[PDB]
């Protein structure tokens, strides 16, 4: 009688075992104990809410608050009057589409005779209708409340959707990640798919309805009825031209692919729309506890209880404390930076920091696609920032004294991420306008310690390697720039502060002065320095300039410290010193190491090893003439378009440290060899497309120019030199696309493909794809990637790559078993429902039944616990388990598949989870909750912005947090979960498909052709004892390193190292001598543990 008294006019009885028509709306939802929405019980929600928005006094009375938001002024009130009238016309469209549905094929006539038309996949909206004469009609309270949710969704959906990477797009389309076309990713994130639009809209509809789900009701109605309403509202928005629908066909690019995907984009409002200063008036008027809002002053966001998009995992108490500290920081608006942005204008901002205007008649088709994506990011960030400024400006007359708070949540890899799309932590444009840092300095004397901090901040913003030089040397470098190239730019900024105007050629002045140092952070350095020059009182200068403590190769260094076992080697000691770990050198900073000891970082070290491997490969095939020519063509092509590859006049090959940046970072991230090859080739094709645009530009200026000079005009001193380069380009492309190398029996053989490149090119629409693209990747994989991966292994160590292999095998095997049991357990439950008369196919299972299936998997240890963090590698949301349609609209379109939260195969995702989660993720968690933690800082991943008044103390604390995170044992945590899984697993109950996947990870190629169940089980237990041996070695190494004196300078910006107060002196020793001393303590620790286990003359 609870919900049966609020909606007594609904069609059908509320009994699950009735005879006629049953109402599944009242059987699936229940009234809450305390109210959550103010529209429950009303008769005209679209009229009561519109009345409350007509005045400030009425808004306060309806909301029951002392005062409303100051931004809710008269201009905003007028704009909401038109929006409410627009929402009344949306309801008229919905009411007219229902009458057509009941008229075609006599649906209404049959439904009134007893036919269960409300249980259809498209008739699920018939559970919220009422009888009216001989026909049916909507329920006014339910219909008008859903319209209000659509209006709020239309205003803020874009600024809340997630960002799709290349991996996500590949899964949706089905095309291989390494063969994704040009601009496909940039097209996908512009709009949203059907599933994303409907699911997000349906979430708001349920919230506004203010009801609670029934745990014993089928998932086909608790999730289908809200979804069926969302699809109808989205269809109405398309008819009203509020949402534009675009259809992309995969058969155009891949004829073998028959998938069709629709994309929906919301039409955006004007940048001067007054509604942009307060777009959450409807949300705060309906919900008792609004979710979308901006926090001012003492308004502190609440702490989330579960991980991001991982509802099965809850934040640990240690993780919740870190979130609370990060949400207490106050942000402030820098007025001089804001006025500079609006004076320059959006057009000049795009011209300076973007691609500017585009003339598509002189651009390549593929080149123009990338330029538009660059412009979109800058333009969207500019619009988002100035909408916030409008809201802040209404709170007080002084915009610089309004504190701002931001919400945080935990990423599945243990990373604190700001909520929203464009915020200081994500957008660089917004980062320079809203700052949490402040300082007061005495700059009246140039020899003060305060002036040295001021110079350090300016130098780092102007692209100067401050962590590789001493303070005195850095000061000399900055002085030359200030009085040299940057002088014209400073003069313009000085006039701007006093007057407030800019010249018509301001873009050209900044472009010439900055050059290769152009960035958003470099603009603030010019303004801050110019403001200091005109300050009347330099002894109390207040500035928001900061210094960023950036880690030196944070990724690779963490891996070699956390997942390395065995005895110490001199090579490890030398290579780990480049990361900031010094043994036997008290109070040694990174600036001293680079200046005197070693000036090569990890990126340069791997480049040198790559040259060594490349020379050995060529010498192996010295007698093979066809193989030698193929290697020459690959290097020749990369020399023409990549600045990191250079060939001398004598044929000597020279490489730069910039060729191993990306490969080294993604190698630690578990990416395979094919992934590196695909990215390397993509860099070459981008340069080729850009060179085609120069051909079109040169032809327009001079139609009589030659083809060679139109291409390599600026890369050749003479015309004859230009003709030489053109011949090289044509020959290399034909050679690299005609034959490919095939690795058989351990040797490489050239095999023809028959799909070589022929004909005359067209600069406007030149494209490389199909079999031509695959031929290029085959040559790159076997001739350049293989030598590259050998050099990387030599630097990081052979033991580190051994730990990654066992970790990948252990996680993949566990995920395969979990996925098979989940699918095998929901099919047995469905077979039981087939004997239930009150059950129909399409209702799926129940939330109570789904929770029992997941609880039965607890004896296999699906989650990894480290004591302060939790990880769930196999968790995902997929529609494979349900394999059925959830709901459609009244036109039998917009079919939405049903997706549930079920485990899935891991693959190579195990390595990134533990390298990042226990690496920089744990370091930043400690830094926010440690004793005497730094205050007023912005914590970007592997970085931290610090004010000029606390650079020394905060940098020392950052190095202390790094040392704490190096005492962990990620392998031991994985071993403990894997040992429990092996105790309870039963391989004899696995499907034949599952047994084939496990054999691909535990056995060799020859051993898995006819392997039995016993062979697979025996091979899986071997991995268990491999993890135990690795984990024991890591534990001993950390114990030994804690007994000696160490200096930690991983955050090398300032030069404030941290000492571990060890009591063993290893100074005045070579790395060869230190390894022997460390190995002596390693053998003593092993003896004690084994001895403990055993326990006159």
């Amino acid at each position: 009688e609870g919900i049966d008294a609020v909606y007594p006019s609904l069609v059908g009885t509320a009994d699950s075992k009735a005879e006629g028509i049953k109402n599944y709306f009242k059987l699936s939802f229940t009234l809450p104990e305390e109210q959550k929405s103010r529209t429950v019980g009303s008769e005209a929600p679209l009229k009561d809410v519109a009345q409350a928005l007509s005045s400030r006094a009425r808004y306060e009375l309806f909301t029951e608050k002392e005062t409303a938001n100051p931004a809710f002024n008269g201009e905003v009130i007028k704009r909401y009057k038109e929006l409410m009238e627009h929402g009344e016309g949306i309801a008229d469209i919905l009411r007219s589409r229902l009458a057509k549905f009941l008229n075609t094929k006599d649906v209404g006539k049959r439904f009134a005779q007893g036919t269960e038309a409300n249980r259809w996949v498209g008739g699920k909206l018939l559970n919220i209708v009422e009888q009216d004469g001989d026909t049916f009609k909507y329920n006014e309270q339910l219909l008008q409340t859903a319209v209000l949710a659509g209006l709020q969704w239309r205003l803020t959906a874009t600024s809340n959707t997630a960002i799709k990477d290349a991996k996500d797009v590949a899964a949706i389309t089905g095309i291989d990640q390494a063969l994704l076309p040009e601009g496909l990713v940039e097209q996908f994130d512009t709009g949203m798919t059907l599933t994303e639009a409907v699911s997000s809209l349906a979430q708001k509809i349920e919230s506004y309805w203010g009801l609670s789900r029934n745990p014993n009701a089928p998932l086909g109605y608790t999730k289908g009825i809200p979804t069926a309403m969302a699809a109808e509202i989205l269809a109405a928005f398309v008819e009203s031209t509020d949402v534009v629908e675009n259809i992309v066909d995969m058969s155009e690019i891949d004829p073998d692919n028959k998938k069709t995907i629709g994309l929906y984009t919301i039409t955006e409002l004007d940048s001067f729309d007054p509604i942009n200063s307060f777009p959450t008036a409807i949300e705060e008027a309906v919900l008792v506890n609004p979710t979308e809002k901006m926090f001012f002053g003492d308004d502190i966001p609440p702490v989330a209880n579960t991980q991001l998009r991982n509802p099965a995992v809850r934040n640990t108490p240690e993780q919740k404390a870190a979130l609370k500290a990060e949400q207490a920081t106050e942000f402030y608006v820098h007025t001089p930076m804001v006025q500079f942005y609006e004076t320059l204008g959006k057009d000049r901002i795009l011209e300076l920091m973007g691609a500017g205007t585009l003339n598509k008649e002189l651009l390549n088709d593929n080149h123009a696609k990338s330029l538009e994506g660059k412009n979109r990011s800058v333009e969207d960030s500019y619009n988002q920032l100035f909408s916030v400024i409008e809201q802040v400006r209404a709170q007080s007359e002084d915009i610089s004294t309004v504190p701002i708070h931001y919400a945080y949540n935990m990423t599945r890899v243990g990373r604190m991420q700001m909520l929203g799309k464009y915020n200081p932590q994500s957008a660089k444009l917004v980062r320079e306008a809203i700052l949490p840092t402040k300082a007061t300095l005495d700059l009246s004397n140039q020899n003060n310690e305060d002036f040295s901090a001021f110079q350090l901040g300016l130098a780092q913003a102007l692209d100067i390697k401050v962590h590789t030089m001493t303070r005195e040397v850095m000061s000399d470098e900055l002085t030359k720039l200030l009085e040299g190239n940057l002088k014209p730019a400073i003069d313009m900024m000085v006039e701007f502060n006093t007057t407030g105007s800019l010249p018509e050629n301001a873009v050209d002045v900044l472009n010439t002065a900055l050059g290769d140092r152009k960035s958003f952070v470099a603009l603030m350095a010019l303004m801050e320095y110019s403001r200091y020059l005109v300050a009347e009182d330099k002894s109390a200068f207040v500035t928001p300039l900061y210094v960023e403590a950036d880690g030196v190769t944070n990724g690779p260094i963490n891996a070699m410290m956390l997942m390395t076992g065995g005895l110490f080697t001199p090579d490890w000691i030398r290579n780990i010193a480049k990361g900031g770990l010094f043994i036997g050198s008290p109070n040694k900073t990174m600036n001293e190491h680079r200046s005197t000891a070693d000036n090569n970082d990890l990126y340069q070290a791997s480049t040198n090893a790559l040259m060594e491997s490349l020379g050995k490969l060529r010498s192996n095939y010295a007698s093979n003439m066809p193989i030698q020519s193929q290697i020459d063509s690959l290097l020749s092509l990369m020399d023409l378009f990549l600045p990191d590859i250079n060939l001398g006049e004598n044929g000597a090959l020279e490489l730069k440290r910039g060729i191993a940046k990306n490969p080294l970072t993604i190698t630690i991230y578990g990416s395979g060899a094919r992934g590196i090859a695909g990215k390397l080739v993509s860099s070459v094709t981008d340069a080729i497309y850009e060179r085609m645009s120069d051909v079109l530009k040169a032809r327009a200026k001079d139609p009589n120019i030659s083809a060679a000079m139109a291409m390599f005009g600026k890369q050749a001193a003479s015309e004859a030199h230009a003709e030489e380069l053109l011949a090289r380009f044509l020959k290399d492309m034909e050679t690299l696309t005609s034959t490919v190398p095939v690795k058989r029996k351990g040797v490489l053989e050239l095999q023809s493909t028959g799909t070589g490149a022929k004909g005359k090119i067209n600069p406007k629409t030149y494209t490389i794809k199909g079999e031509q693209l695959k031929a290029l990747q085959e040559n790159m994989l076997h001739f350049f990637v293989e030598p590259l991966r050998n050099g990387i292994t030599q630097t990081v160590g052979e033991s580190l790559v051994y730990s990654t292999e066992q970790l990948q095998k252990a996680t993949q095997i566990q995920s395969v078993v979990l996925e098979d049991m989940f699918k095998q357990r929901v099919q047995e439950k469905l077979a039981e429902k087939a004997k239930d008369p009150t059950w129909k196919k399409g209702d799926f299972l129940t939330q109570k039944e789904l929770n029992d299936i997941q609880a039965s998997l607890n004896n296999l240890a699906p989650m990894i616990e480290t004591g302060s963090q939790t990880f769930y590698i196999a968790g995902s949301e997929n529609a494979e388990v349900a394999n059925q349609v959830l709901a459609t609209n009244l036109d039998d379109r917009m079919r939405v598949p049903m997706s549930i939260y079920a485990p899935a195969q891991a693959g190579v995702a195990g390595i990134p989870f533990m390298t990042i989660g226990t690496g920089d993720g744990m370091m930043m968690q400690t830094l926010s909750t440690m004793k005497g933690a730094p205050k007023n800082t912005l914590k970007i991943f592997d970085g931290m912005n610090i004010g000029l008044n606390d650079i020394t103390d905060a940098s020392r604390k950052a190095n202390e947090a790094v040392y704490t995170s190096w005492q962990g044992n990620p392998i031991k945590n994985v071993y403990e979960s894997y040992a429990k899984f092996m105790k309870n697993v039963d391989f004899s109950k696995l499907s034949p498909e599952a047994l084939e996947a496990i054999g691909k990870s535990a056995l060799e190629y020859d051993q898995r052709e006819n392997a039995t169940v016993d062979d697979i089980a025996n091979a899986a237990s071997l991995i268990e004892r491999n993890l135990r041996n690795i984990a024991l070695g890591v534990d001993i190494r950390h114990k030994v390193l804690d007994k000696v004196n160490l200096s930690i300078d991983q955050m090398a910006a300032v030069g404030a190292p941290y000492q571990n107060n060890g009591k063993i002196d290893l100074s005045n020793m070579t790395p060869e001598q230190q390894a022997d001393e460390l190995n002596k303590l390693f053998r003593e620790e092993l003896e004690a543990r084994k001895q403990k286990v055993a326990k006159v003359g």
């Binding site: 005895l567 080697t569 029996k745 351990g746």
Partner: protein
Amino acid sequence: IDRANQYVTDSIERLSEAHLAKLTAAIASEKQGEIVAQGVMTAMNQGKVWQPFHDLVNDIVGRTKTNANVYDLIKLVKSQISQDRQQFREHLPTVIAGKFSRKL
């Protein structure tokens, strides 16, 4: 010789307290006739087996640094010698005798 090698091997394991072994087995088990007529240098060059041998000698000479002690490398060099003697002195004569349908 075989008895002497076994005694020395067992006396080294008392004091200290895989892939190329398969390629050499394929060399001595060839049954083509047109391949064995080209000599044994060609088969080893085509068989890629020269690469695992280079890694071990590089540690003995000292070109490539390694953490293994003397007793670990001695057990590796003496394991390759016994593999060639087992394959070429015992398994090869059985292949030749298996081409006749009779016991000579």
